[PDB]
Amino acid sequence: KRLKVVAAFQQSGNSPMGMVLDAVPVIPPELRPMVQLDGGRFATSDLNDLYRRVINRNNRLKRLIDLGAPEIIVNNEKRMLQESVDALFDNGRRGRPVTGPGNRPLKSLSDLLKGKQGRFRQNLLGKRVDYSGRSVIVVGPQLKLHQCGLPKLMALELFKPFVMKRLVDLNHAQNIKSAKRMVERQRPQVWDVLE
Amino acid sequence: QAITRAMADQARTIRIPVHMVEVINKLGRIQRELLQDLGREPTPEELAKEMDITPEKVLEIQQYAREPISLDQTIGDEGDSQLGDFIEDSEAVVAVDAVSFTLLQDQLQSVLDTLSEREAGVVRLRFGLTDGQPRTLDEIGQVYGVTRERIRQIESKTMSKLRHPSRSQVLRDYL
Amino acid sequence: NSVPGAPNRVSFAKLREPLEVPGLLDVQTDSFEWLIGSPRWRESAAERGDVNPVGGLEEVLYELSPIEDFSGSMSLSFSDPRFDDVKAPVDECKDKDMTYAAPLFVTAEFINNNTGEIKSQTVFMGDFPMMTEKGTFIINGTERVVVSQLVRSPGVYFDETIDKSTDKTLHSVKVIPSRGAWLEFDVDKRDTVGVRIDRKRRQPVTVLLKALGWTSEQIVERFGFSEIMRSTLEKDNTVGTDEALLDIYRKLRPGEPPTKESAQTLLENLFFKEKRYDLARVGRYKVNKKLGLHVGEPITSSTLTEEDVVATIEYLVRLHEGQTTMTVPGGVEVPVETDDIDHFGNRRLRTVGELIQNQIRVGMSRMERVVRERMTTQDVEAITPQTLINIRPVVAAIKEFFGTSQLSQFMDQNNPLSGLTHKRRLSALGPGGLSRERAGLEVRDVHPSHYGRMCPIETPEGPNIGLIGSLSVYARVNPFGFIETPYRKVVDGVVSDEIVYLTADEEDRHVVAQANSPIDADGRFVEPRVLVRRKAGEVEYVPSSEVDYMDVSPRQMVSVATAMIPFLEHDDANRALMGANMQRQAVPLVRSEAPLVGTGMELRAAIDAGDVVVAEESGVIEEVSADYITVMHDNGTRRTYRMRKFARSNHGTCANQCPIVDAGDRVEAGQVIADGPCTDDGEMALGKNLLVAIMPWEGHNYEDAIILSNRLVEEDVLTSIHIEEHEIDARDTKLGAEEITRDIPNISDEVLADLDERGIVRIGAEVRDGDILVGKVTPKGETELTPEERLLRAIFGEKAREVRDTSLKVPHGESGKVIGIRVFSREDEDELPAGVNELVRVYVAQKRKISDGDKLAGRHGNKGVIGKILPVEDMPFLADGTPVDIILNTHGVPRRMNIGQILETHLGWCAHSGWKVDAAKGVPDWAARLPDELLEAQPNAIVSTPVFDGAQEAELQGLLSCTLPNRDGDVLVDADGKAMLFDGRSGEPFPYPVTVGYMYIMKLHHLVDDKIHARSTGPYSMITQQPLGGKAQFGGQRFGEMECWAMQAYGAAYTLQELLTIKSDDTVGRVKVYEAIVKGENIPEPGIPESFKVLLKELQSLCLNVEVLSS
Amino acid sequence: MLDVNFFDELRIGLATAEDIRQWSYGEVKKPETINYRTLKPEKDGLFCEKIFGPTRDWECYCGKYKRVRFKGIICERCGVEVTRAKVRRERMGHIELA
Ligand SMILES: [Zn+2]
Secondary structure (H helix, E strand, O other): OHHHHHHHHHHOOOOHHHHOOOEEEEOOHHHOOOEEOOOOOEEEOOHHHHHHHHHHHHHHHHHHHHHOOOHHHHHHHHHHHHHHHHHHHOOOOOOOOOEOOOOOEOOOOHHHHOOOOOHHHHHHOOEEOOOEEEOOOOOOOOOOOOOOOOOHHHHHHHOHHHHHHHHHHOOOOOOHHHHHHHHHHOOHHHHHHHO | OHHHHHHHHHOOOOOOOHHHHHHHHHHHHHHHHHHHHHOOOOOHHHHHHHHOOOHHHHHHHHHHOOOOEEOOOEOOOOOOOEHHHHOOOOOOOOOOHHHHHHHHHHHHHHHHHHOOHHHHHHHHHHOOOOOOOOOOHHHHHHHHOOOHHHHHHHHHHHHHHHOOHHHHHHHHOOO | OOOOOOOOOEEOOOOOOOOOOOOOOHHHHHHHHHHHOOHHHHHHHHHOOOOOOOOHHHHHHHHHOOEEOOOOOOEEEEEEEEOOOOOOOHHHHHHOOOOOEEEEEEEEEEEOOOOOOOEEEEEEEEEEEOOOOOOOEEEOOEEEEEOEEEEEOOEOOEEEEEOOOOOOEEEEEEEEOOOOOOEEEEEOOOOOEEEEEOOOOOOOOHHHHHHOOOOHHHHHHHOOOOHHHHHHHHOOOOOOHHHHHHHHHHOOOOOOOOOOOHHHHHHHHHHHOOOOOOOOHHHHHHHHHHHOOOOOOOOOOOOOOHHHHHHHHHHHHHHHOOOOEEEOOOOOEEEOOOOOOOOOOOEEEEOHHHHHHHHHHHHHHHHHHHHHHHHHHOOOOOOOHHHHOOOHHHHHHHHHHHOOOOOEEEOOOOOHHHHHHHOOEEEOOOOOOOOOOOOOHHHHOOOHHHOOOEOOOOOOOOOOOOOOEEEOOOOEEOOOOOEEEEEEEEEOOEEEEEEEEEEHHHHHOOOEOOOOOOEOOOOOEOOOOOOEEOOOOOEEOOOHHHOOEEEOOOOOOOOOOOOOOOOHHHOOHHHHHHHHHHHOOEOOEOOOOOOOEEOOHHHHHHHHOOOOOEOOOOEEEEEEOOOEEEEEEOOOOEEEEEOOOOOOOOOOOOOOOEEOOOOOOEEOOOOEOEEOOOEEOOEEOOOEEEEEEOOOOOOOOOOOOEEEEHHHHHOOOOOEEEEEEEEEEEEEEOOEEOEEOOOOOOOOOOOOOOEOOOOEEOOOOEEEOOOEEEOEEEEOOOOOOOHHHHHHHHHHOOOOOOEEOOOEEOOOOOEEEEEEEEEEEHHHOOOOOOOEEEEEEEEEEEEEOOOOOOEEEEOOOOEEEEEEEEOHHHOOEOOOOOEOOEEEOOOOHHHHOOOHHHHHHHHHHHHHHOEEOOOOOOOOOOOOOOOOOOOEEOOOOOEEOOOOOOOOHHHHHHHHHOOOOOOOOOOOEOOOOEEOOEOOOOOOEOOOOEEEEEEEEEEEOOOHHHOOEEEOOOOEOOOOOOEOOOOOOOOOOEEOHHHHHHHHHHOOHHHHHHHHHHHHHOHHHHHHHHHHHHOOOOOOOOOOOHHHHHHHHHHHHOOEEEEEEOO | OOOOOOOOEEEEEEOOHHHHHHHOOOEOOOOOOOOOOOOOOOOOOOOOHHHHOOOOOOOOOOOOOOOOOOOOOEOOOOOOEOOOHHHHHOOOEEEEOO
């Protein structure tokens, strides 16, 4: 079991120094957005809170080291730094999870890549797609096997650019903006080109 | 002192200076002390009377003290989705107005090419279309060997011919 | 009957009910009465436990007081919880969005034991929300309803387990008290015992009994017969009380050196102190009953005691010996058996009183902490209770409970039955409950104790199946939290009228009889063997003389939503379940015709739902109008009931109230005055009576599909008024102020015709999807003014229009007329939220007709969408020429096992056409047991059928035999129910007769208008560029990995890549594709998804060097 | 590495501190996110524009350059490299641990 990792660290040209960590990266801000909602309320991805905790602990440890403090306080600060990086990389893996407001575990980096709600099986494997709709089904016994019914409004919404071009070409609308206005108003000429 | 200072400038996701976190704390304490003595929520005008300051500032500080919320807390009564799934990305390109802008640029190029080339270049560099910067008249004179009054006159000719309904109707529609 | 305005509902019921159904809202009103301690509840306990009449608030205050300091020379106490009048009546608090609440007052006694002074200060506790007559709270205008919760009652629970190694039996216990540390006593795999204290797996009983001041002689005297515990005590290996105390300290508080006194006080503070271990008043009595400790003593000292521990030891060890009865020294004898955790004698019911009590208890705990902090920091005699008190945590706790809590949820009100069933509903999820993931298969099952207490049919079909249910119709909540049902007691085969109430545990020691037994009016069952329910839920035969109880009535095991299903006993449990669930989600039509065939529960359900006007005091009617009714009471004074017209329900339905009285009639107290949304003459009416043919017609009614005639569309038989509200607020901003004004930039005039100069739509004006509603203009600030914009304004002379027109517009896919506009603003001196200064809300209503895709269903489990609405010509019609209205398939009813609705169809046809039984030469054999006044029935006569005692097959067949015609001489249906009918398409008669008759159908709240959605290019999310989801947002269907499997299996690669990259994610791909399709150009090559780049950056941020190599 | 959907292999390995500081475009050293009043990000904060690029397209902190013609030039005042605005999704930060 030990050789399983020792041989990997041997034959591969990577130093095991990477096991311990002394310089922690910071995700791009747009991946941890801070956005003002309608009403002045602000939202954050809980990553800003963990990064703030890391920054606070690191700065306080710097102050303790530079000032000169008894080794108990320095050890406590180093332990807090270790636990803060712990919470950042994987919250709740060790000890009780770091909790914010509302008494809920915070979403660390690991929790953003795990399970159904993780990125892998929620955004990468299957995505919400455009040019799609959904509606109730009704038996179509008069249809042919290769045919299927479609609501007029749903068909209009789906084929919006298609009818846009096909009607601005037939001079019903002078420009694309007029075509959009006709489509949104649902002018009678729209239905013929839609069909 | 150390604990209060740290809680002031370190305990907030949106950091607030101590000089006015002080007045948030005092506003809260006075409002909750007067609420029990009066029996009702203290109107911000009365709170301002206790402040010896304008009420509008009281509403401003009240809306400043509000802390941010979490994007990932489950929003429903049943746990199925997070808040961040329901926030629209404003910075994203509309993908409809882009094609509209391109076709508007095409229409502008056609209209300008319909006009005389000197006028087209004059207005193009006057409003900085082909380059990043619009230019003043003296630049137009230095690039066309004319006085600035002549450029004013040709600009007058440009928007005079541009008021022609042939262009006016074909371009005004694009809005 | 017994209702002053009850319509004449003839009934097929054989036996009579000794008691009427109680007010089905009594589990919400009575619990709140206990909470407050109203005089009604005060006298209620006067003959039901007057030994200690105390309310919930009184109990909490008494438990809290007295609170003192570390010195004990100064303290504070609370008493006299007095309420006050409500701030505003219900409707105005529903209007301007304020909580229906009243101030709370209590008296505080400040004592100073050092010298002695008194300070009785009447402190304002806060603003306590109140419960309305309907049993619903109002929070911020919205109407919220709290539901009771099912939890394990704190106490003692022995259980049995098989080791599955040598088949040795093992017995474990879990004394699970609320707010305390668990104790798990059991017999281990080997002979000794395990005494797990707070999850620490060491130290058998030897150290515990020794730690209680005993030694080896006590444990050897108490236990000489139990060789297991004898072996254990021999394996003590420890001598010394202090040694046992320190050994406990090892596995109870490690990390701190022990001392001689620390462990001794630690044990008391952990178990025998009522601050860290207090099984509630329910728990102490449960323990006493389980162990026979105290049988005639008042309830006090909620903390667990030592004799309780020794009795637990004795009970467990005797259970391991297989003993039957244990007699504790100093108590009565108790039989020894394992305790079931799902038996309703061990599952309590936390009603609204208990939940609000717990939240108030948390608030008072915070209160005690803060007052304990403050009473010392201030000098004596300079301190007053007002400054000792800071009521903020109490109101914070009540606001925390009422909002953003999943046990007090938004009222489900789209018809009276949904409101009735939302309250009086038993839930199991929430704080202290079990989640659906935490829920096993055993809990979801129906326990034999569910009978009469909780309905076994009414439960949602989704993931929450079995977790949440509904209360029975006769069920009662004991003042103790346990559930309880009434039952008549039979003595020596004599049935008494005396009604006594039994809980789940009291039923085992008795034998209850069958609900519908052959009673001879003398109390004696004609046969000795009678269907009875035994102790363990077993059903068996038994002679009559030894039974001692009987059901009060049939339909006692069933709820109120399922008691409205006619011919229930002829239906499968699953279909009855779904029918009961669809009864909850019918829509209020515009006429609400009463059903021909139903059950007597409809009248009571409509009456006590609270939404039908009931004359509180008898008297003549002074005057009647649509808006109001003025009724003159006998004692001179009058009363005006203000009718509520066209009010939007929580689900956007109609709630009109039409009076059904005249200007000169006399009304008695309790008679229905006006009808609600889904009521006719004060009785429930959730649908319409439609003629039904059960033939499969040309495939348009294939696979549960249902076809309708155009008469329903033309006659407005099934049409619903739907109302929506659109809030919009103008608020202060650093840019300035947003104005509700008509100065809207770059808008035409034909769309400005229907706005007032105030800037909002004229009342009574038609709008549709995309039309502007309120003109709200915001300062745009600044941006990059395009040069092209400058040339644009230079061509027409258009102003810069310095403001942004983010006005409110009708969202996609709705229309209708506007009903009302409500506007609030700061200069109107209103209580607007801090930040907003105008807020206008507009009500738009449309008369939604019935179309394809709308779901229609019966109350027997049959459902289906409208396959087509074909004209009146193409409908099979009888020889009289009346076209059928609704046609359903025949291939669903026999397979799905819902034959009850066919019987309902036949009974409905009999009730519609009318009947008379020829009583010339005596009554026929089938009608001998049929009651009088049921042998004659005029056309369109309403009937009734109790769910489990209704019309039998023979009676219905006889009724079908004689079905006298209405106007002409034409017996359309034959004796067997089927009838000839003429095709409307080809014209020739159908070869064989088919069943026809009147069926009660209802329109469900799953209309296709609110269910159709489509998008081409909407908005996108922030982190990943995937489009959002839902109907409020523009949406976009989720193409999950399961569909990715199908597309990969098809071998279609280009389609999959299209659906992934450009159609969803690749931003440049999206815009380029849109440009290409608009320009009529070829769609370009898909790019790289943005979510993959997001994942790469995320993985990089996790200290993982991930680089993609070209070569 | 140019992201043209021409890939032959994807590799993952332990990241040393030299790589972590190589990815970063600066060292975030202040726990400051957004100015409570100006509604702007701060210097060396978690949202610093100098480290992570400009929030608005083609503008520095004080708006010295608000024009397209400035491409790829890092301003001398705040060091915000005037460029396109989605670099906030691409660039990266790092913290030097005590
Ligand atoms: Zn700058």
